[PDB]
Amino acid sequence: SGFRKMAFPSGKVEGCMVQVTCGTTTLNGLWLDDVVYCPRHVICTSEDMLNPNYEDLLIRKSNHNFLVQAGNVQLRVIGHSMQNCVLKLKVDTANPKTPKYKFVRIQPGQTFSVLACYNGSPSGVYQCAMRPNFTIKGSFLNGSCGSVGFNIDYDCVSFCYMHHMELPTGVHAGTDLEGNFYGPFVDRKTAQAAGTDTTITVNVLAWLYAAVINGDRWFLNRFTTTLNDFNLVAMKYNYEPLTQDHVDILGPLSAQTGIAVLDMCASLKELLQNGMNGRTILGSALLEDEFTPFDVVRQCSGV
Amino acid sequence: SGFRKMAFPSGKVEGCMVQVTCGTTTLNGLWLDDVVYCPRHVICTSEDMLNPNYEDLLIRKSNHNFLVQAGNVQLRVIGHSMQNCVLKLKVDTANPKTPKYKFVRIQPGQTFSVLACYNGSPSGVYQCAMRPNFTIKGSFLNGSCGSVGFNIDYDCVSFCYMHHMELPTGVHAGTDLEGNFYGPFVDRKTAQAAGTDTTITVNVLAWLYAAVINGDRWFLNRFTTTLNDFNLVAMKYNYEPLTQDHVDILGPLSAQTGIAVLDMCASLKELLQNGMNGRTILGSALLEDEFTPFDVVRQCSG
Ligand SMILES: *[C@](O)(C(=O)NCc1ccccc1)[C@H](C[C@@H]1CCNC1=O)NC(=O)[C@H](CC1CC1)n1cccc(NC(=O)OC(C)(C)C)c1=O
Ligand SMILES: *[C@](O)(C(=O)NCc1ccccc1)[C@H](C[C@@H]1CCNC1=O)NC(=O)[C@H](CC1CC1)n1cccc(NC(=O)OC(C)(C)C)c1=O
């Protein structure tokens, strides 16, 4: 038993991380087969960053201007191509530890593991939700750019995030592995801000389910609410509306505990309205919204 | 920017995980060079247990009774011994993926990463602290036994924990990799009680420095305290004593923030006496005690 924020084992991704230097700029790339993927802003000086003409900056770069290091081995670059905000560097050597992988775009409210790297060396691993405002609550310093976010399903790595930037309020923005930003963000040194965030109602209910499965159950009550009457209180507190698809997605946790979603909703309404009165749920004194229903099932059934 | 509960990358440990089976029981083993380490209770059934005589039960096992699988390769067991509560199984093959490593016994308040495994297959990585009562707050289901805790120093993996058992209210116990339990626990099927836990004071101060490094400053007051006057208040709220050694260990964070340790103690004293009054620190509504000073410096620096 017990319930913890849990990342995927990162070994399959660690074997792909490399360092990419272009003149003065060093950051991280992802080496899969004979291609290294990284943020295109590797070609910029801070001069270029106010309004960078990436197409014109890239014309002035040769294969030779890209230093790619995997451990203590130099990889020779034999081709460069740009796709949206990502640079693809073709190398002579294919990554022999390339795992089975796909590039996917995660939806808001879904979770992934971040492998934070510096100089192409993994430093740490932690779990993030793609927020409704298309930011993540991460931990990234200078050199973290080109760090990736992923899910593992069996032997297959689904790469969903490459790190690009920090925003006021200490949150982070990046692109999918095709180089499209999540949210309205741009890869240049302009003032940008995240929109107002919302709480991911479906994820809070999943976590309440997690609590109950682990025997932390003091917040359960005999009361029930309609979906409409629940959503009246949710909207006031800046929680996403709960849809019938959310109620259906919570079906496995509801069946496993025997607590109906609309019974659980009466707990959550009381917690929103009256707070926790000095008590904790799974060691937290506030409502956690960064576990998906699938994250709870995976951890409580142990795959 | 941002501050997260962070684990070490697990790759170097993933390549060491194997499945150990003795008839009916399967759990995880750690394969380093030509030795597999696993909990000794892999030799029991329900038949035994409640209070098994492990030395006795191990006599009546043979090398061949240990099925060791590394992915879908069978390892040949050519030797076996018990050391405290772990089995060391000698195998015909050295692990090609053995990282540079040590075995260390960690102290209460120290943190480590857990790679939770099922059938020799890693499932997840998370960060833990050795509580003052020598339990950990883990996430471990049936089959998790033999999962290990570790720190990574540069290239070198320090193994500090092997998972053995669950205790009341969802907490966990295990041994070091020499098979000595952390705490007054035994690998018996019998009821055992943890002992009352306390807050790791040096770790709360470390995390208040993390808060200041990351732009959370509201809880700083303009007071200082003596070590003694601080501990008078700490002990009243179930906090570990803060030693001069803890003050000295908070030095680097002190210098990096220009907030003296005893000034930060005066801020914590006020937080214990008056509460947080519904405000958060680094996204938490209570005081977090599972970041060491080392963890704060590591994450804020590289
Ligand atoms: C990323 O580019 C990176 O790591 N680059 C390599 C490098 C940088 C610095 C020194 C050595 C090597 C960084 C990652 C950032 C830095 C701190 N934590 C992070 O997540 N991203 C940027 O610096 C980014 C580049 C832009 C998108 C193309 N950038 C540029 C300018 C400003 C910001 N943000 C910013 O100033 O935000 C506030 C909160 C205002 C400080 C930015 O992210
Ligand atoms: C460990 O043995 C394991 O994972 N392998 C055994 C196994 C069981 C079922 C199927 C396949 C393999 C487990 C790990 C436990 C299970 C639940 N969570 C864990 O972390 N260890 C034990 O079951 C352990 C063995 C004892 C030390 C030698 N054990 C046995 C009996 C009771 C408990 N604890 C217990 O019941 O705790 C209370 C607080 C009473 C609920 C126990 O840990």
Coordinates of N, CA and C and ligand atoms in Angstrom, one line a residue, chain A residues 1-2, chain B residues 24-28 39-42 44 49-50 52 54 117-119 139-147 161 163-173 181 186-192, ligand 2:
Chain A
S1 N 0.8 -1.2 0.0 CA 0.0 0.0 0.0 C 0.9 1.3 0.0
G2 N 0.3 2.4 0.3 CA 0.9 3.7 0.2 C 0.7 4.3 -1.2
Chain B
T24 N 7.2 -21.3 -4.9 CA 5.9 -20.6 -5.0 C 6.1 -19.1 -4.9
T25 N 7.1 -18.7 -4.2 CA 7.4 -17.2 -3.9 C 8.3 -16.6 -5.0
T26 N 7.9 -15.5 -5.6 CA 8.8 -14.7 -6.5 C 8.8 -13.3 -5.9
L27 N 10.0 -12.7 -5.9 CA 10.2 -11.3 -5.6 C 11.5 -10.8 -6.4
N28 N 11.9 -9.6 -6.1 CA 13.0 -9.0 -6.9 C 14.4 -9.3 -6.3
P39 N 15.7 -10.5 -0.5 CA 15.3 -10.8 0.9 C 15.3 -12.3 1.1
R40 N 15.7 -12.8 2.3 CA 15.9 -14.2 2.7 C 14.5 -14.9 2.7
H41 N 13.4 -14.1 2.9 CA 12.1 -14.7 3.0 C 11.5 -15.2 1.7
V42 N 12.3 -15.1 0.6 CA 12.0 -15.8 -0.7 C 12.0 -17.3 -0.5
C44 N 10.6 -19.0 2.2 CA 9.4 -19.4 2.9 C 8.1 -19.6 2.0
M49 N 6.7 -19.5 8.1 CA 6.2 -18.1 8.4 C 5.6 -18.1 9.8
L50 N 4.9 -17.0 10.1 CA 4.5 -16.6 11.4 C 5.7 -16.4 12.3
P52 N 9.4 -18.2 11.1 CA 10.3 -19.3 10.5 C 11.7 -19.2 11.0
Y54 N 15.0 -19.4 9.6 CA 15.6 -19.2 8.2 C 16.8 -20.0 8.0
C117 N 9.8 -2.4 -8.2 CA 9.8 -3.4 -9.2 C 8.8 -4.5 -8.8
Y118 N 8.3 -5.2 -9.9 CA 7.4 -6.3 -9.9 C 7.9 -7.4 -10.9
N119 N 8.2 -8.6 -10.4 CA 8.7 -9.7 -11.3 C 10.0 -9.3 -12.0
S139 N 5.4 3.3 -1.7 CA 4.3 2.8 -2.4 C 4.7 1.4 -2.9
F140 N 4.3 0.4 -2.2 CA 4.8 -1.0 -2.3 C 3.6 -2.0 -2.3
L141 N 3.4 -2.7 -3.3 CA 2.3 -3.7 -3.4 C 3.0 -5.1 -3.3
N142 N 2.2 -6.2 -3.2 CA 2.6 -7.6 -3.3 C 3.6 -7.8 -4.5
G143 N 4.7 -8.4 -4.3 CA 5.8 -8.6 -5.4 C 6.9 -7.5 -5.3
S144 N 6.8 -6.5 -4.5 CA 7.7 -5.3 -4.4 C 9.0 -5.7 -3.7
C145 N 8.9 -6.7 -2.8 CA 10.0 -7.1 -1.9 C 11.3 -7.3 -2.8
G146 N 12.4 -6.8 -2.3 CA 13.7 -6.8 -3.1 C 13.9 -5.5 -3.9
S147 N 12.9 -4.7 -4.1 CA 13.0 -3.3 -4.7 C 14.0 -2.6 -3.8
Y161 N 19.0 0.7 0.7 CA 17.7 0.1 1.2 C 17.3 -1.0 0.3
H163 N 13.6 -3.5 0.1 CA 12.3 -3.5 0.7 C 11.9 -4.9 1.2
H164 N 11.4 -5.0 2.4 CA 11.0 -6.3 3.0 C 9.5 -6.2 3.4
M165 N 9.0 -5.2 4.1 CA 7.7 -5.4 4.7 C 6.9 -4.1 4.9
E166 N 5.6 -4.3 5.1 CA 4.6 -3.2 5.4 C 4.4 -3.2 6.9
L167 N 4.1 -2.0 7.5 CA 3.8 -1.8 8.9 C 2.5 -1.0 9.0
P168 N 1.9 -0.9 10.2 CA 0.6 -0.2 10.3 C 0.6 1.2 9.6
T169 N -0.6 1.5 9.0 CA -1.0 2.8 8.5 C -0.2 3.1 7.2
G170 N 0.2 2.1 6.4 CA 0.8 2.3 5.1 C 2.2 2.7 5.1
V171 N 3.0 2.4 6.1 CA 4.5 2.7 6.1 C 5.2 1.4 5.9
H172 N 6.5 1.5 5.7 CA 7.3 0.4 5.1 C 8.7 0.2 5.9
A173 N 9.2 -1.0 5.8 CA 10.5 -1.3 6.5 C 11.3 -2.2 5.6
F181 N 18.2 -4.8 9.3 CA 17.0 -3.9 9.3 C 17.4 -2.5 9.7
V186 N 11.8 -7.0 12.5 CA 12.3 -8.4 12.1 C 11.5 -8.9 11.0
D187 N 12.0 -9.7 10.1 CA 11.3 -10.3 8.9 C 10.5 -11.5 9.3
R188 N 9.5 -11.2 10.1 CA 8.5 -12.2 10.7 C 7.1 -11.8 10.3
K189 N 6.2 -12.7 10.2 CA 4.8 -12.4 9.7 C 4.0 -11.8 10.8
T190 N 4.6 -11.5 12.0 CA 4.0 -11.2 13.3 C 3.7 -9.7 13.3
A191 N 2.7 -9.2 14.1 CA 2.4 -7.8 14.4 C 3.7 -7.1 15.0
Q192 N 4.0 -6.0 14.4 CA 5.1 -5.1 14.8 C 4.6 -3.6 14.8
Ligands
LIG2 C1 7.1 -8.9 0.0 O1 7.3 -10.2 0.7 C2 6.8 -9.2 -1.4 O2 6.5 -8.3 -2.2 N1 6.7 -10.5 -1.8 C3 5.8 -11.4 -1.3 C4 4.6 -11.6 -2.2 C5 3.3 -11.5 -1.7 C6 2.2 -11.7 -2.6 C7 2.4 -12.1 -3.9 C8 3.7 -12.2 -4.4 C9 4.8 -11.9 -3.6 C10 6.0 -8.2 0.8 C11 5.8 -6.7 0.5 C12 4.5 -6.2 1.2 C13 3.2 -6.7 0.6 C14 2.2 -5.5 0.9 N2 3.1 -4.4 0.9 C15 4.4 -4.7 1.0 O3 5.3 -3.8 1.0 N3 6.4 -8.4 2.2 C16 5.6 -9.1 3.1 O4 4.4 -9.5 2.7 C17 6.1 -9.2 4.5 C18 7.0 -10.4 4.6 C19 7.6 -10.5 6.0 C20 8.9 -9.7 6.3 C21 9.0 -11.2 6.2 N4 4.9 -9.2 5.4 C22 4.3 -10.4 5.8 C23 3.3 -10.5 6.6 C24 2.7 -9.3 7.1 C25 3.3 -8.1 6.7 N5 2.8 -6.8 7.1 C26 1.5 -6.6 7.5 O5 0.6 -7.4 7.4 O6 1.3 -5.4 7.9 C27 0.1 -4.9 8.6 C28 0.6 -3.6 9.2 C29 -0.3 -5.8 9.7 C30 -0.9 -4.7 7.6 C31 4.4 -8.0 5.8 O7 5.0 -7.0 5.4

